[PDB]
Design a protein around this ligand. Structure first.
Ligand SMILES: *C/C=C(C)/C=C/C=C(C)/C=C/C1=C(C)CCCC1(C)C
Length: 227
């Protein structure tokens, strides 16, 4: 097939794999129980991304959805990735500030809605309705970000500065990166079709790699993960 976006898919696969192995190696050397917890969650995130980037590189996770008078190329494997990686990242943040079970449940649930309506919108055949689903998915994301910014930051204040400071950074990287996904979707192949797929794939790999390996490097190198 040789689609123009394959090189970014190859690069995404490469970065996710390397990040996975490094976290795995670093994770199985640590003896602290809590640190092990964080390591297991954070290593699994890029591990899942790697498998999906690899599948997409190999030609899977792609479907032609008709709308706008065109046969549009929609990479659905992405939602198969995000369905599990986004809540895991959320869990990392939750464990960090000792969030409550109710909070976590509500965040993971909002997250499920976000990815769920996102895919439904990415698969919808009525052009205008694709944006209705997109709109709902974004509303869910803003709920999650609101909670992370207003709820979590507040509870991270019961933690040590080292832990509060690590959370701030992770929270910040998350707010900035996550905020970017809906915009990429809106102007890319799933939406307005302004930004071509090859470029769109490039933007997504940069956000995904930054949001997973970037996020993991920051979290796993901190002393805040220790019991
Ligand atoms: C490793 C992957 C990460 C951190 C992915 C984050 C993905 C999002 C914040 C995705 C958000 C979306 C919307 C707000 C609406 C349209 C569809 C999505 C799923 C692209």
């Amino acid at each position: 097939t040789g689609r123009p976006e394959w090189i970014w898919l190859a690069l995404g696969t490469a970065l996710m794999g390397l990040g996975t192995l490094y976290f795995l190696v670093k994770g199985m050397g640590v003896s602290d129980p809590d640190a092990k917890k964080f390591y297991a969650i954070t290593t699994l995130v890029p591990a899942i991304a790697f498998t999906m980037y690899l599948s997409m590189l190999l030609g899977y996770g792609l479907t032609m959805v008709p709308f706008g008078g065109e046969q549009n190329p929609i990479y659905w494997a992405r939602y198969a990735d995000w369905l599990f990686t986004t809540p895991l990242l959320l869990l990392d943040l939750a464990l960090l500030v000792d969030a409550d079970q109710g909070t976590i449940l509500a965040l993971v649930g909002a997250d499920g809605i976000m990815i769920g309506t996102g895919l439904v919108g990415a698969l919808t055949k009525v052009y205008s309705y694709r944006f209705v689903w997109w709109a709902i998915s974004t509303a869910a994301m803003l709920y999650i970000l609101y909670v992370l910014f207003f709820g979590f930051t507040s509870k991270a204040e019961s933690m040590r500065p080292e832990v509060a400071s690590t959370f701030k950074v992770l929270r910040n990287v998350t707010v900035v990166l996550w905020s970017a996904y809906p915009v990429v979707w809106l102007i890319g192949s799933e939406g307005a079709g302004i930004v071509p797929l090859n470029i769109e794939t490039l933007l997504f790999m940069v956000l995904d790699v930054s949001a997973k390996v970037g996020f993991g490097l920051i979290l796993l190198r901190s002393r805040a993960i220790f019991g």
